[PDB]
Write a protein that binds this DNA or RNA. Structure first.
Length: 638
RNA sequence: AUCUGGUUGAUCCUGCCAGUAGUCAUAUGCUUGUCUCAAAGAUUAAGCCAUGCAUGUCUAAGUAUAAGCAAUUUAUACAGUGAAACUGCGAAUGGCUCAUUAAAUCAGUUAUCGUUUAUUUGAUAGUUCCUUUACUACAUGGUAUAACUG
RNA sequence: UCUUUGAUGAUUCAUAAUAACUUUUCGAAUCGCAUGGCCUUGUGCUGGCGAUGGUUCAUUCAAAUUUCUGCCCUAUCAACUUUCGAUGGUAGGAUAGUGGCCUACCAUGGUUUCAACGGGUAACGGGGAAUAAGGGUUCGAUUCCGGAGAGGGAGCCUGAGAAACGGCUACCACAUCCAAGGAAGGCAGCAGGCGCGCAAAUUACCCAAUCCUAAUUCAGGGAGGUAGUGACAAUAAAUAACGAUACAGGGCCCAUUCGGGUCUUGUAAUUGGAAUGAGUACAAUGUAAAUACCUUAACGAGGAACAAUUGGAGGGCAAGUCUGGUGCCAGCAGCCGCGGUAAUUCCAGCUCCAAUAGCGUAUAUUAAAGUUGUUGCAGUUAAAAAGCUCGUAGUUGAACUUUGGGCCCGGUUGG
RNA sequence: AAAAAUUAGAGUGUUCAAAGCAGGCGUAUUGCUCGAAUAUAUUAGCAUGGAAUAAUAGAAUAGGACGUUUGGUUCUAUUUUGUUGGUUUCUAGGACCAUCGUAAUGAUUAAUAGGGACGGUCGGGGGCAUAACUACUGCGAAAGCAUUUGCCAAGGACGUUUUCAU
């Protein structure tokens, strides 16, 4: 008979309809749920407490809104209709930084709009562009009040269609805007947040994060006490083998874990709880790089060609006074040295490595470089960057000591000088983050630079700006490289944004295992909020094969052109570099090489061969290269 | 009330495969300015279902001491309005789907001298104290419970 | 010097009497309004309109059974039914009531080549729907009437009426809350779900209309109405119309020959002015309130931008002798086929053709099809007459039995 | 007598149309007024007209049909003997029972359908016993069928003023 359906049906789908259950139904509504809800107003004159009271009048209790009015920004409310509990938060618009993390704790973001204006670019539209570029879960756009447009009906219709504007180019994934003045539109905004949960972010999810409910200090010692933290664990958990960072306080060491309706402690398998770990000096102790410049006449290149020749409003003005001067050096003459020689040009700049080739030989990154500071010695370089990436993600679930959705009175070993600036949780959120094994140790890192939209003001490599990665607010001096496809990682050193191609930023900072996107902003009080949004990007890897370049190219005014000797004017008033740079072959900048043999005189006269035209339409050129290193970072607060 | 291309060097046939129009016949591709009229979870799974609604009802004329209101006044039984609750009636109509079912359903056609029927419309009831008026009310017999208080 | 008696085609029918019989049925211990007439004047006696209830006969809305004839493919289903009711007789039980409906004793019947009985159905039946010279072929889950069902089977309560599921109770399959003691559940009603697949709309406003229910004019109604989403289908029809010169030709004519008239175009980023709704929007009207359509202030074009699109250009089948690929970006277009450079088909530019809101492609079905043949095909050589004669059912079967003659009335037609 | 809707269709300026069932006229001053048709047995049942075509029954052993030929056997009592019940006399009124009378008493042809007899013949037809003639043509339902003699039965055609009515 025709039970063969119930064969083929109930034996095609039985496990494919099983892979997606408990992630959806761990939120059953008496004890096991906590839905985290954030509300962002998009104009400065809004009452989100009233928007809350437009979201709860349709909930069929009555005595929930009136007693919760005075000064509270965190709410925990149980919905006795769809049987779910919510965690309703609301930040403070006077600060900007608090807005940027109240999104990234949540999964549904209530986007309010305005029925009297449009959005503003630098503050509303940028904060929309802020959260989607750092990554966010799903959301709902909404309008609170539509009383202001005149009480005829058709005029209150089309003003919705105008407000669709920022969901045609921003998102082709959301077409409705719910009018909360309508009672029947204000209910399926309550249906969806009590009954769904979206694909959230990748990196914040897979590490564990708890929001605080009760924070109190207890005494263990006058050197260090303890803080009890009450909350519910989200993410994957918190175990006693690694560390925890909280912003504006930093990193602190736990002691014990207790789940209160499993008593755990911290073992002695801690990591190096310091900034500059002493486990880096017993890995590199070889004295085998001796590129020297103390008595070297010409850099030894005996493996690169010919025989050598031996002898027997007050903030902006200080920053742009030498900014646009480098257009002569970066853009119109990119390969150039500064020369108007009337001074003692016998010893003006000497220490160099002027080899001609770029991408076919060896260059020792590590040297005994006097430009290489004390970071270069006591640091660990675990140089395998693919298996160690995939090792750390596997071990974490195996050391599962805390499962998600638990009521914890979390204790932590904590000092005594930081018992003041933590406020009550009702006026400010308090969250923690699970820090992996050996992340806080500083090392070398590499970023990527996505240039900010309609902002072509470049920035040199000499500014310790704060770059947001993960949750960490760290000021850091960046240096910039290219991402050219070559099997040696010798790329071009640039100093600014390359306005055409996504640039690569080399840095020295603690490692980020989460592969979090990078955020380039400038803290300056020019804007009322202490942010100048200047860029964004992401982290890729930690590099060990970098060879940077420093250009200094001797070009000037040529006048004399013989087939073997070429004399160039305003060059040699003190001829020393012609006898100092024998094994650095000259070349015409039209792509034609040449040979330097001897100093034929004193004012530009040297032996110079030409491959093409012998005339003063192009200047013979040199090539110089050096190597220096970035500066480490610092955790920025305030 | 109509036919055209294809077997052979060339021709007449049997013969099928392309073509050609229609569909209140369903999907699908690219396009899309106006007026009138409008089908729409049937096919496959008569598979599973979060939340809210879809069945209640009073006149001058069955029962009011609301510790209801209105007070307003001819009214010492009550009389204005009128929650709750008992009693009466309805909930068997309507709406939705097409799984079963092949002399079954169902159609046009007969039969009840072979039966039940709220309602509606029209008729219809001096006889019934042991009595023809002898004890024992007909100017009128008896308990029990609801709402409500605690 | 003494009888009445209904109706039907038909009755032991209606209806009446006599003896009785019964856990003795019904025969107003209810309610609003009015307030009068009579008197020995006693709260004496009578007396109006109508609400609700009541037994039986008629009646209306019904219900339950029943008579005759009528269904798609299949013999690779020829014999089926009768212990355990199958066909009939007699007496009881049960029901609103007839009847093997059930129970006792007996008889041995009933269906079948004019297809019983069994198997398939991606089968609810009809009114009807598409195509059509005539005959026909293929559909009908779906606005009206009839039946069945409420996750799957069974059982009963209250009632005039239900084997009811927005009633209850059991087992079967499910699945919800839980202080673990227990307690609750049926979207094939309306909106809406996460499932499936080629495949199908809003958790909106109201009882104003249509009609139903209630103790009732007043309350109720996802029944039903109004909008949102809708290239499912069907009707009406914007995307330009008029001049001037100009230069051409044809053109009829003055033609002498010119130009004397009449024309027709052709074009001249040659030049002019008039018309108008798509759209916007004061008012009014619409409507239960609104939205839109009809009406109408002010606004609204050289339109080059307020800009039509799908498919083809050997043949069938309307449309090219056109230039470009080193075969950038070659099987190749339903079927004959075109490629081996430059192609009278691929890939692109230009110019033409067809429909104008494309019927462009896919899958079913109808005409074409006299290729299902009753109307109406095919016999030797093309697919196709059984090895041979007797013989079932089925179909088909010679001729013959009152014709002719005469008279006369009364129809509408050519007249 | 076969419901409405739909289909063919009459009337009717929704501004035309698909639709709808409306609408038209005066003084517009308290009004009169026409509509909402008709057709479509399309099996089976019901009422009715006609007697072609094609079936079916009737008298052959006459228990045949008509008769007021005559003898019977029965069964009913409506009526009158006011009336009532108790009797039978007729009388009508039902059937069946012999024989006595008159009608012209009562049987379709004999298929250039079929069967059955009958008379003279013909044939390598078949069974038992004891080549040449073979094509030009012989016989048998077919496959098939050749030396003479005799038995046993069968069969076509012809001939006929026989018979039965497939």
């Amino acid at each position: 008979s025709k039970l063969q359906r119930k064969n083929k049906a109930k034996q095609l789908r039985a496990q494919r309809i099983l892979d997606s259950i408990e992630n959806r139904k761990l939120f059953e509504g008496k004890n096991g749920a906590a839905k985290i809800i954030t509300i962002v107003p998009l104009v400065n004159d809004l009452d989100p407490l009233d928007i809350l009271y437009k979201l709860l009048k349709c909930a069929d209790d009555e005595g929930i809104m009136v007693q919760e009015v005075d000064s509270k920004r965190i709410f925990n409310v149980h919905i006795k209709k769809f049987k779910s509990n919510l965690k309703i938060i609301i930040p403070d618009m006077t600060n900007f930084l608090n807005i940027l993390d109240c999104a990234k704790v949540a999964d549904f973001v209530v986007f309010g709009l305005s029925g009297v204006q449009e959005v503003d670019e630098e503050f509303g539209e940028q904060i929309i562009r802020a959260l989607e570029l750092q990554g966010i879960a799903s959301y709902i756009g909404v309008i609170s009040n539509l009383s202001a447009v005149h009480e005829k009906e058709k005029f209150q219709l089309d003003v919705k269609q105008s407000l669709e504007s920022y969901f045609k180019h921003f998102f082709p994934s959301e077409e409705r805007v719910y009018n909360l003045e309508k009672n029947s539109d204000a209910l399926n905004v309550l249906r969806t947040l009590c009954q769904r949960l979206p694909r959230s972010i990748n990196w914040r999810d897979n590490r564990g994060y708890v929001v605080a409910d009760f924070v109190d200090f207890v005494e263990t010692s006058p050197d260090s006490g303890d803080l009890v933290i009450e909350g519910t664990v989200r993410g994957i958990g918190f175990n006693a083998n690694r560390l925890v960072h909280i912003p504006d306080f930093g990193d602190f060491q736990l002691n014990k874990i207790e789940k209160i309706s499993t008593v755990f402690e911290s073992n002695m398998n801690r990591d190096t709880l310091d900034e500059y770990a002493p486990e880096g000096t017993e890995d590199w102790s070889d004295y085998d790089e001796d590129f020297e410049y103390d008595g070297l006449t010409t850099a030894r290149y005996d493996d690169h060609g010919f025989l050598p020749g031996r002898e027997q409003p007050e903030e902006e003005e200080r920053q742009l006074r030498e900014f646009r001067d480098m257009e002569k050096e970066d853009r119109e003459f990119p390969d150039e040295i500064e020369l108007e020689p009337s001074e003692s040009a016998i010893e003006r700049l000497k220490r160099y490595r002027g080899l001609k080739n770029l991408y076919n030989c060896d260059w020792q990154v590590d040297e005994k470089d006097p430009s290489s500071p004390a970071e270069w010695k006591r640091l660990l370089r675990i140089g395998n960057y693919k298996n160690t990436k995939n090792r750390i993600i596997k071990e974490t679930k195996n050391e599962a000591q805390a499962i998600a959705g638990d009521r914890i009175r979390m204790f932590i070993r904590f000092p005594k000088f930081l018992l003041e600036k933590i406020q009550d949780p009702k006026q400010l959120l308090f969250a923690v983050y699970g820090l992996l094994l050996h992340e806080h140790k500083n090392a070398v890192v590499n970023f990527s630079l996505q240039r900010w939209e309609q902002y072509d003001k470049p920035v040199p490599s000499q500014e310790p700006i704060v770059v947001q990665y993960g949750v960490r607010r760290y000021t850091i001096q960046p240096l910039f490289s290219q991402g050219s496809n070559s099997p040696n990682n010798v790329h071009k050193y640039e100093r600014f944004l390359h306005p055409d191609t996504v640039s690569v930023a080399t840095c020295i900072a603690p490692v980020d295992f989460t592969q979090s996107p990078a955020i380039f902003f400038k803290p300056s009080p020019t804007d009322a909020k202490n942010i100048e949004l200047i860029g964004h990007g992401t982290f890729l890897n930690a590099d060990h094969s970098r060879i940077l370049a420093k250009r200094a190219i001797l070009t000037g005014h040529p006048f004399r052109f013989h087939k073997t000797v070429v004399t160039v004017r305003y060059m040699f008033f003190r001829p020393e570099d012609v006898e100092w740079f024998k094994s650095i072959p000259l070349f015409t900048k039209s792509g034609r090489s040449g040979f330097i043999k001897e100093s034929l005189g004193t004012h530009g006269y040297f032996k110079a061969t030409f491959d093409g035209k012998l005339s003063a339409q192009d200047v013979v050129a040199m090539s110089l290269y050096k190597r220096m290193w970035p500066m480490p970072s610092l955790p920025w607060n305030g």
